[PDB]
């Protein structure tokens, strides 16, 4: 089997991407944030505290003939941005892009934090990291990918995120039309439950490539590229008037600037992030200070190849017995 679904930016900045997902019988379609940095499929629901719902589409398990309470199971998750959610668990049929899993754990939110409530466009998350991070207790549950894997034509999914445009998540196949050149594969450590890999280095603009190992995770659920402070300082030093602002919470730059590209290494291959991808717009409405898309990972305890980096590539998440990542230009 295979599946193919379009993923759509939630706003003009590509702050996140939503992908429609069918849950239940008859189908209830919710727009979920596919997150390769977490392992819970959770949704706004008929159980969510009413004051914490503001415009999201909810899953109502009592209207699904295939929903069953997973008795005694609870979940609770905290993300890197400080947001959180928790609740109880149903099993139900879940389809993505024509690919169906029966008996998927659908984590129904009873509580969500303010950042979820305030984002009307995201109806929940679909985690695609390793199932060892799933938060369901007392019986840990599998991700949608892990439950689909054995049925897929190939045990892979691919992320093809757009810059200010829709893109695609495919399950079970490589679309050889979706990228240029060849795919370079690189080793993954699953020890922290992430798609953790080691970049071979970087370049700023037209500058020389610096060969240096940068361990980090491929995380579709993180907007920005978070890298060591040395690397980030070297990038923003090429932008006149850029500075790190403790008041704003990262590097800012004059909105009048033209940003340089940023290149990262994948083995001997190179992925180029155009400068435009690094512009996250005014810090507040009407400001001439703009927020940067490359930020320091110092204090986060891991480097994160988020959407800024991943949307410059066609990315293969290879879930074979020994997982690997692949990157191609596109
Ligand atoms: Na922000």
Curated annotation (Swiss-Prot):
UniProt keyword annotation of Protease present: yes
Statement: the UniProt record of this protein carries the keyword Protease: yes
GO-annotated biological processes: proteolysis
Protein keywords: Aspartyl protease, Disulfide bond, Hydrolase, Protease, Signal, Zymogen
Domain Peptidase A1: 17-328
GO molecular function ontology, one term from the record: aspartic-type endopeptidase activity
Family: Belongs to the peptidase A1 family.
Protein name stated in the entry: Endothiapepsin
Lineage: Eukaryota, Fungi, Dikarya, Ascomycota, Pezizomycotina
Gene: EAPA
